[PDB]
Amino acid sequence: MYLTLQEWNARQRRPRSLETVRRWVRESRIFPPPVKDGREYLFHESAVKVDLNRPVTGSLLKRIRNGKKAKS
């Protein structure tokens, strides 16, 4: 039923740090909130960032391909 704080960080796209996710809990921007068991916080497989300032970083990729001229 519950995902661990370490497995929640590993499932968030590009995992940064366990202190970064613990700072996001101290800001109160993850909903619904995780259950404190005693050793570490238990997140449900559904709890996500609520009203965040991060849409997309912006990555373009383009190639250049050459041609060839033949005569007779």
Swiss-Prot record:
Provide the GO MF annotations for this entry. DNA binding
Q: Does the keyword Nucleotide-binding apply?
A: no
Keyword Oxidoreductase part of the UniProt annotation: no
Concerning SUPFAM superfamilies, the annotation shows: Putative DNA-binding domain
Give the matching InterPro entries.
DNA-bd_dom_put_sf, Excisionase-like, Excisionase-like_sf
UniProt keywords (A-Z) are: DNA recombination, DNA-binding, Viral genome excision
Gene3D superfamilies according to UniProt? 1.10.1660.20
Biological process per Gene Ontology, one example term: DNA recombination
**Described purpose of this protein according to its UniProt entry:** Excisionase and integrase are necessary for the excision of prophage from the host genome by site-specific recombination at the att site.
Q: Can you say what this protein is called?
A: Excisionase
- Taxonomically, what lineage is the organism? Viruses, Duplodnaviria, Heunggongvirae, Uroviricota, Caudoviricetes
Quick one: which gene encodes this? xis
